[PDB]
Amino acid sequence: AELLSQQWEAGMSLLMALVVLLIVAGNVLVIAAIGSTQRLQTLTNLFITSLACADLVVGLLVVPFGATLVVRGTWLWGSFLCELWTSLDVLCVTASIETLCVIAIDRYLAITSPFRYQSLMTRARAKVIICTVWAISALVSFLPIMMHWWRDEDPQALKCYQDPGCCDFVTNRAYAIASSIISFYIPLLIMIFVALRVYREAKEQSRVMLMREHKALKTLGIIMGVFTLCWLPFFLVNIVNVFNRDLVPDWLFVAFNWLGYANSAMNPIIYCRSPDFRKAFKRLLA
Ligand SMILES: CC(C)CCC[C@@H](C)[C@H]1CC[C@H]2[C@@H]3CC=C4C[C@@H](OC(=O)CCC(=O)O)CC[C@]4(C)[C@H]3CC[C@]12C
Ligand SMILES: CC(C)CCC[C@@H](C)[C@H]1CC[C@H]2[C@@H]3CC=C4C[C@@H](OC(=O)CCC(=O)O)CC[C@]4(C)[C@H]3CC[C@]12C
Ligand SMILES: CCCCCCCCCC(=O)N(CCO)C[C@@H](O)[C@@H](O)[C@@H](O)[C@@H](O)CO
Ligand SMILES: CCCCCCCCCC(=O)N(CCO)C[C@@H](O)[C@@H](O)[C@@H](O)[C@@H](O)CO
Numbered sequence: 001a002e003l004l005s006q007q008w009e010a011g012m013s014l015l016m017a018l019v020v021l022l023i024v025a026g027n028v029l030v031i032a033a034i035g036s037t038q039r040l041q042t043l044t045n046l047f048i049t050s051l052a053c054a055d056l057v058v059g060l061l062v063v064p065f066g067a068t069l070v071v072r073g074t075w076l077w078g079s080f081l082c083e084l085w086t087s088l089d090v091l092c093v094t095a096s097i098e099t100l101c102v103i104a105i106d107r108y109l110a111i112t113s114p115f116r117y118q119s120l121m122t123r124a125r126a127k128v129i130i131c132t133v134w135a136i137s138a139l140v141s142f143l144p145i146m147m148h149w150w151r152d153e154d155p156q157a158l159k160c161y162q163d164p165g166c167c168d169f170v171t172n173r174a175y176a177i178a179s180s181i182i183s184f185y186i187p188l189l190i191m192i193f194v195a196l197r198v199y200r201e202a203k204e205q206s207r208v209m210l211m212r213e214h215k216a217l218k219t220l221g222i223i224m225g226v227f228t229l230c231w232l233p234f235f236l237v238n239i240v241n242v243f244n245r246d247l248v249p250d251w252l253f254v255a256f257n258w259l260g261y262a263n264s265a266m267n268p269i270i271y272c273r274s275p276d277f278r279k280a281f282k283r284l285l286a
């Protein structure tokens, strides 16, 4: 009874810490490698840095908080932080998918108008792009949450809000469909459409130099593919609940949200496809 709980609590704590460590180490490495290697200070890598910040915030704030909820079986932190924590979860996935769109659009430009790209894209503009992405993402994630537009009047929902250790994100149907479409489905569709155009236009192409560029693009394709595979299951289930709560078991819905968090750990590994990152990683770790 109490022993079963102790064994579970301690092993789950150990796993959670590992996940945190992997997400924080991996993404600090990416930021530090870029911050300190002129060869890696390209404009595309400024977008990568932004993605790494999104993932780092998941490692430092989103996951640690969720971990305490999984390990201890209740929300220990009060009402405000529960809402802030929710806000930050929506924020990061929103900022991630929006950044991935930008990366795909940056690459489409560079490949179809290399010279028009040359005269448009500067460090100053890349900064504006990044900031705009985080602005829109903040707008779409915080306000509806601070305006309580997500709340329901279901008996289930009143139960949770009248229980100080409840921090499920029980939402009304309108918000579920709206936030999913606005945070995820639309940027998803744009990203896929643009990523396929980048695929067609890369096909209409020293041989050594073009191979190295296609290796790099494939790496970006992989980042986008893995991100879709990590989050699409959660968002699909999010929709399905609006229509039928029985069609898909609870435990798998929760797990899918954790699969989403897990994506924040994957990008640094995936970047080891690149000689340059690999070398910068090995050098940084001394
Ligand atoms: C806890 C949450 C709610 C706050 C989120 C933090 C943001 C304000 C961060 C996330 C991404 C960050 C940006 C990521 C990348 C850049 C590029 C950077 O350009 C550089 O010259 C340094 C790049 C390098 O490492 O070589 C300037 C800061 C800026 C705009 C950062 C400004 C602050 C941003 C928007
Ligand atoms: C909220 C959901 C429903 C829509 C998300 C779509 C976004 C993922 C993408 C699609 C096109 C992107 C935009 C394409 C071009 C620009 C111009 C870009 O660069 C500048 O404006 C620099 C101009 C300057 O200051 O000189 C600013 C960001 C922005 C609006 C991008 C922000 C992110 C956008 C809106
Ligand atoms: C959750 C976070 C949400 C991000 C918040 C975005 C706010 C807008 C970002 C911003 O302030 N700038 C966009 C930058 O692209 C302008 C800055 O550059 C600012 O420092 C200016 O006053 C200077 O340009 C003048 O020296
Ligand atoms: C970007 C996302 C922004 C989404 C904004 C959604 C706001 C819609 C708010 C809303 O529709 N409700 C109040 C929430 O403040 C009420 C209902 O959703 C629900 O609570 C009850 O009417 C039930 O009886 C079911 O119909």
Ligand SMILES: CCCCCCCCCC(=O)N(CCO)C[C@@H](O)[C@@H](O)[C@@H](O)[C@@H](O)CO
Pocket: 015, 019, 070, 254, 255, 256, 258, 259, 262, 265
């Ligand atoms: C309240 C009920 C919540 C219970 C669910 C908690 C599951 C613990 C989350 C976790 O860390 N993992 C399970 C994920 O569900 C393992 C991850 O490390 C793994 O997903 C990824 O590292 C791989 O997919 C990468 O290839």
Ligand SMILES: C[C@H](CCc1ccc(O)cc1)NCCc1ccc(O)c(O)c1
Pocket: 066, 069, 070, 085, 086, 089, 090, 093, 168, 169, 175, 176, 179, 180, 183, 238, 254, 257
């Ligand atoms: C904070 C909340 C619950 C996360 C959670 C719930 C239970 C757990 O045991 C562990 C984690 N996750 C929100 C996911 C989400 C993300 C984006 C959206 O647009 C949306 O409607 C919902």
